[PDB]
Design a protein around this ligand. Sequence first.
Ligand SMILES: Nc1ncnc2c1ncn2[C@@H]1O[C@H](COP(=O)(O)OP(=O)(O)O)[C@@H](O)[C@H]1O
Ligand SMILES: [Cl-]
Ligand SMILES: [Cl-]
Ligand SMILES: [Cl-]
Ligand SMILES: [Cl-]
Ligand SMILES: [Mg+2]
Length: 852
Amino acid sequence: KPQDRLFAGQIDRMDRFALRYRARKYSSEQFRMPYSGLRGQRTSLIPHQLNIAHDVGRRHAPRVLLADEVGLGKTIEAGMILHQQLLSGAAERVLIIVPETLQHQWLVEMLRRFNLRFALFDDERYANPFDTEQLVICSLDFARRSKQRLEHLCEAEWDLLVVDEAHHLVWSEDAPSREYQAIEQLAEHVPGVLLLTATPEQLGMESHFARLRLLDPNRFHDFAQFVEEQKNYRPVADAVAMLLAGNKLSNDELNMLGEMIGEQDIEPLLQAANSDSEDAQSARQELVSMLMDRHGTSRVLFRNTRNGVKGFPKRELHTIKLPLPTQYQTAIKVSGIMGARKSAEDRARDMLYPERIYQEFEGDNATWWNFDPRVEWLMGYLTSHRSQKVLVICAKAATALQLEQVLREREGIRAAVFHEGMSIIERDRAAAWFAEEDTGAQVLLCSEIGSEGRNFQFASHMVMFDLPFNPDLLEQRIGRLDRIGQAHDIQIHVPYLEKTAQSVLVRWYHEGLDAFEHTCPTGRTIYDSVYNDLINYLASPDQTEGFDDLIKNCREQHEALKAQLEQGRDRLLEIHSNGGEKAQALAESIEEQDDDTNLIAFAMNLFDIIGINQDDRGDNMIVLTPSDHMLVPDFPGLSEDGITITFDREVALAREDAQFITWEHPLIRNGLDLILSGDTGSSTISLLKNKALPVGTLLVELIYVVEAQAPKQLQLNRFLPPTPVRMLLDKNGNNLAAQVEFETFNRQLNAVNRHTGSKLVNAVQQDVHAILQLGEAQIEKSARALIDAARNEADEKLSAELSRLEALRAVNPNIRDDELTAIESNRQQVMESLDQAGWRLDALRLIVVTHQ
Ligand SMILES: Nc1ncnc2c1ncn2[C@@H]1O[C@H](COP(=O)(O)OP(=O)(O)O)[C@@H](O)[C@H]1O
Ligand SMILES: [Cl-]
Ligand SMILES: [Cl-]
Ligand SMILES: [Cl-]
Ligand SMILES: [Cl-]
Ligand SMILES: [Mg+2]
């Protein structure tokens, strides 16, 4: 094929040949690396997250509970797992079931951090229809709405299922939820399952066990036995955990340990660890790993905690008590007198957002913002903090929009607005404007959706124009800025109107739950426990008999539950969930990759040759725009509006509007596919100025490709991706390639006029044919060596992993049958597909020695 082009007179420019060869070499090498699938995401490199993702993401059909505490990165961990599985080919179809109001947050996270475009399925967009899309997000309610729909989902042949906030799957002996039942049915037909929930087990042990049974109903079949085994385990594991903290062990703990591990002699290991010797610490970390292989929830549950990971800011509450204006006092009394009585909730909501009462009787569009002291306080705060990036949160979009107008007209400060009525692209623009340094918006006004999952590293100040109606929404608001890696303490300003539901609720959240300044896993439990009572205080804030006691009771419940949670921590599992030194090393290794000058040089040459225009902005960023004369009509991922790119991870994290270019980015992969599936650079001729060789000497640079045809799911690329084999032959068939390195030789060559070129080739066409014949014999030898080596490394690696899981099963009940059968079956189909591998000539460059 490539020789046919050359002789038909079709001669590419030399630089195209070099680009083609580099593209093959690079793509064949970036497939066989340990951190593959953990580079391309727009995230910081946090060890505990990478620990989970690298462990879970490389398994066959992962079935796990991701139970990290709030803010630790359960969404990011799920993303890295999906990213790895979809890049490697282990998965192709993914379903993500989330709570109703979280769909857009997930859609943006998957696309903007993992370059994965999920299709949103709801009833408005579609009143089976799931074969249409490979990546689907929908709500839990949507998925369980009808029995027809559920069965549609089960038969849609999903590879992986992700269920966010899985504590909504509630179970009971006599009436499990519809939610639970729906996931129970789906989990039987999807091989891989990720359940995400931070809910501590002490608040629902039974439901916790039910979720584990969704993952492995075979192993998790006896609630009582499971609890008993965990209870007997804690004594062992608590001590060992106190040893990784360096408090030496007893003689009691030493026989319990020798027994807990009867599969081998650990007397040396124990003698070391339980002593003040320089070999004591490593003896401890190894013991910890042995205990975790025997853990009851080993391999299935990952629970990192904020106490352990410790990268989170302090939270500081600043309340401002403001006088209640006569206009609102009047409206409250009028409503109590002339009021068509409403629900408890609706009266409370009226008292929490008093502008709603005022608008009811003065008509909507009444200028509440002209006398509401919260508005005046906000104007004052913002005009004296003009250089502070401030996140301002209201419950309702209409309130945020009304504030934007006031702030602009009365003080000339332009705020970005963020609410669910706006399109994704509209929120993208508002987000970029708020993130813009020095020239951008100083304020982001949000409805209850906050800032979704977008990072504003520079924002540490938050104003709650009003308060949310329940504690889950409160923590979600604070979680917009209380994020891992935020250095500056969060200042939470709460201006509130005295003698209203606002003052009641601010006191309840703060004094009852301590929910502002400390992350509160107790909030929902206490709220539901006192709901009726609290709602009446909110509905009648001027009738507060017994409120002081409610506060006292609620705080006592909060402290009691906090104590239970502290006492019930599995501190061994917490340590093991962070990943230790192996996880730190994995993060360090990925970061070493990041500084890849090869990729930057390759990508520029690639885009240039494809025909994409490149404008440099100086700030580690470049603007890419389509051109008239590009290799293809429309390059996927490239709009006529252009795209901003960066190759630097820290820039990409600060500029969420820019693409983060890595070997794993679709632009590179699409770019490689374009060049390598086509003719570009496959046929050329060059001159070599060299007087130490006879003039007219002919050299043929041959690039063969060795590749095995197989389904992507087999993941042959781990062992034999399409691999180039470069030969450099003379007339006698001597292959010089082993001692003539490609780059050094490539530099020594000269381009030649294409017309003069096609004349040189025709003059030596027959010599070339003979050389090509000599190459075919040598490629068979080379390809057979490459193939046999890969077939053997597949044997070694895959048999090694099957042995590792069989050895784990001897001590661990959580290794599943289908896991061992999957490795076994894959080791077989991989070896067979390689022994059908083939080769072909991909490119050639003729080289003619001159002396001139
Ligand atoms: N490694 C990371 N790099 C960048 N952003 C991160 C990282 N980890 C978490 N975040 C951000 O922190 C926020 C919380 O992440 P998330 O996974 O939703 O926490 P949760 O465990 O409560 O579900 C999100 O906005 C996410 O984008
Ligand atoms: Cl992988
Ligand atoms: Cl895929
Ligand atoms: Cl006032
Ligand atoms: Cl942020
Ligand atoms: Mg979450």
